[PDB]
């Protein structure tokens, strides 16, 4: 409360260290679906259904350019696109398996670089 701090986590290499998953993420082979924004022209239901659009260049780009606070902001849209992938594809697909394993390798790294 006011002038009552919890101790200060050192937050100086998020920055660095969310790129450098995002990276891993980048050149994982099963990132193909995800590397760019689903074309809202050429894909029926798409642009109705999926209320919040995400992909791993908006999420670089925003990264880049400060337009994330914080580390949780960061992790928030890197699952957005993996829910988003999940409402729109069926688990026995290989968009859909995609997903799935992108996310258990997205939620290790995250697990072991920052918890």
């Given at each position: 409360?006011?002038s009552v701090k ?8 998020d920055?660095?260290l ?8 980048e ?11 689903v074309?809202?022209?050429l ?6 259904v ?29 699952r957005?696109?993996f ?8 688990d ?6 995609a ?11 995250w697990?072991?670089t920052?918890?």
């Amino acid at each position: 409360s006011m002038s009552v701090k919890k101790p200060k986590r050192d937050d100086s290499k998020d920055l660095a260290l969310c790129s450098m998953i995002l990276t891993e993420m980048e050149t994982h082979e099963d990132a193909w679906p995800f590397l760019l924004p689903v074309n809202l022209k050429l894909v029926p239901g798409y642009k109705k259904v999926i209320k919040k659009p995400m992909d791993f260049s908006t999420i670089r780009e925003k990264l880049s350019s400060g337009q994330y606070p914080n580390l949780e902001t960061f992790a928030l849209d890197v699952r957005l696109v993996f829910d988003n992938c999940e409402t729109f594809n069926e688990d026995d697909s290989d968009i859909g398996r995609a997903g799935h394993n992108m996310r258990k390798y997205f939620e290790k790294k995250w697990t072991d670089t920052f918890k």
